[PDB]
Write an enzyme that holds these catalytic residues in place. Structure first.
Site, PDB file in Angstrom:
ATOM      1  N   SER A  26       0.804  -1.211   0.000  1.00 47.99           N
ATOM      2  CA  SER A  26       0.000   0.000   0.000  1.00 47.99           C
ATOM      3  C   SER A  26       0.845   1.273   0.000  1.00 47.99           C
ATOM      4  O   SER A  26       1.848   1.367   0.711  1.00 47.99           O
ATOM      5  CB  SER A  26      -0.936   0.012   1.220  1.00 47.99           C
ATOM      6  OG  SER A  26      -1.878  -1.050   1.161  1.00 47.99           O
ATOM      7  N   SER A 104       2.273  -7.184   1.492  1.00 51.54           N
ATOM      8  CA  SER A 104       1.155  -6.518   2.141  1.00 51.54           C
ATOM      9  C   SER A 104      -0.119  -6.612   1.281  1.00 51.54           C
ATOM     10  O   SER A 104      -0.574  -7.726   1.004  1.00 51.54           O
ATOM     11  CB  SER A 104       1.577  -5.068   2.420  1.00 51.54           C
ATOM     12  OG  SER A 104       0.711  -4.436   3.341  1.00 51.54           O
ATOM     13  N   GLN A 105      -0.720  -5.480   0.881  1.00 49.94           N
ATOM     14  CA  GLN A 105      -1.925  -5.543   0.035  1.00 49.94           C
ATOM     15  C   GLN A 105      -1.614  -6.344  -1.235  1.00 49.94           C
ATOM     16  O   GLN A 105      -2.466  -7.072  -1.752  1.00 49.94           O
ATOM     17  CB  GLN A 105      -2.459  -4.142  -0.331  1.00 49.94           C
ATOM     18  CG  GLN A 105      -3.731  -4.247  -1.179  1.00 49.94           C
ATOM     19  CD  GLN A 105      -4.371  -2.929  -1.578  1.00 49.94           C
ATOM     20  OE1 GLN A 105      -5.197  -2.894  -2.512  1.00 49.94           O
ATOM     21  NE2 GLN A 105      -4.014  -1.840  -0.887  1.00 49.94           N
ATOM     22  N   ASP A 159       4.220  -8.732  13.358  1.00 48.37           N
ATOM     23  CA  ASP A 159       3.548  -8.123  12.204  1.00 48.37           C
ATOM     24  C   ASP A 159       2.081  -8.527  12.360  1.00 48.37           C
ATOM     25  O   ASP A 159       1.668  -9.638  12.004  1.00 48.37           O
ATOM     26  CB  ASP A 159       4.108  -8.632  10.866  1.00 48.37           C
ATOM     27  CG  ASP A 159       3.492  -7.911   9.653  1.00 48.37           C
ATOM     28  OD1 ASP A 159       2.534  -7.128   9.825  1.00 48.37           O
ATOM     29  OD2 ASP A 159       3.968  -8.132   8.523  1.00 48.37           O
ATOM     30  N   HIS A 172       6.128  -4.888  10.182  1.00 51.41           N
ATOM     31  CA  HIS A 172       5.563  -4.950   8.831  1.00 51.41           C
ATOM     32  C   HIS A 172       6.470  -4.275   7.797  1.00 51.41           C
ATOM     33  O   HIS A 172       6.380  -4.550   6.594  1.00 51.41           O
ATOM     34  CB  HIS A 172       4.173  -4.300   8.790  1.00 51.41           C
ATOM     35  CG  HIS A 172       3.413  -4.564   7.524  1.00 51.41           C
ATOM     36  ND1 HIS A 172       3.153  -5.840   7.063  1.00 51.41           N
ATOM     37  CD2 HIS A 172       2.823  -3.725   6.641  1.00 51.41           C
ATOM     38  CE1 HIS A 172       2.430  -5.774   5.959  1.00 51.41           C
ATOM     39  NE2 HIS A 172       2.219  -4.499   5.681  1.00 51.41           N
TER      40      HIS A 172
END
Length: 197
Positions: A26, A104-105, A159, A172
């Protein structure tokens, strides 16, 4: 370094042997973000510049933070974009071995796209690496419809996104070392397992 469109720009008459499709996290820049370039450099060292095509997921994938909260952990538009890239790869270079990754995303996007992919194409992805996998708990550390032996998840202790939350904590943002070593090591090994050397 953050934008690579090797598949889109690539000449079909001279296809690479390996095609890597990667989705950034992101708010990250270009189509590779913070981790992609590191992985890319190591793949290039292993297969050579003309041996591997690096393709980030750009276009409709805006990597909007808020989209982490949608059902699949990303938008429908983003999934359509990544599916389209896998389809382009299959059409442009039918004999190339594919590899994928996401952070992540982008890890949720990679998982969603792979789950929806036609199995004949999905079966060509020799290995997939996911960092800070937002659907790690929900999917029990797997990518639906994809083998565990071809999957490698990097989820750091602390995380929170790997533990079913959407909170962004310091761990993260600590996948740098993983992207420089074990992640490309895994991808290279998986490609060699099926292509030989």
């Amino acid at each position: 370094e953050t934008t690579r469109d090797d598949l889109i720009n690539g000449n079909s008459a001279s296809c690479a042997d390996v095609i890597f499709i990667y989705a950034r996290g992101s708010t990250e820049t270009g189509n590779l973000g913070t981790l992609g370039p590191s992985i890319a450099s190591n793949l290039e060292s292993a297969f050579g510049k003309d041996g591997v095509w690096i393709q980030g997921v750009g276009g409709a994938y805006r990597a909007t933070l808020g989209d982490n909260a949608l059902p699949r952990g990303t938008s429908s538009a983003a999934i359509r974009e990544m599916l389209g890239l896998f389809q382009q790869a299959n059409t442009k270079c039918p004999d190339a071995t594919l590899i994928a990754g996401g952070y992540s995303q982008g890890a949720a996007l990679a998982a969603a796209s792979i789950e929806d992919l036609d199995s004949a194409i999905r079966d060509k992805i020799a290995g997939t690496v996911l960092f800070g996998y937002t659907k790690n708990l929900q999917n029990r550390g797997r990518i639906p419809n994809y083998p565990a032996d071809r999957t490698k998840v990097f989820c750091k202790t602390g995380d929170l996104v790997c533990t079913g939350s959407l909170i962004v904590a310091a761990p993260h943002l600590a996948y740098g070392p993983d992207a420089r070593g074990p992640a490309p090591e895994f991808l290279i090994e998986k490609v060699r397992a099926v292509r030989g050397s």
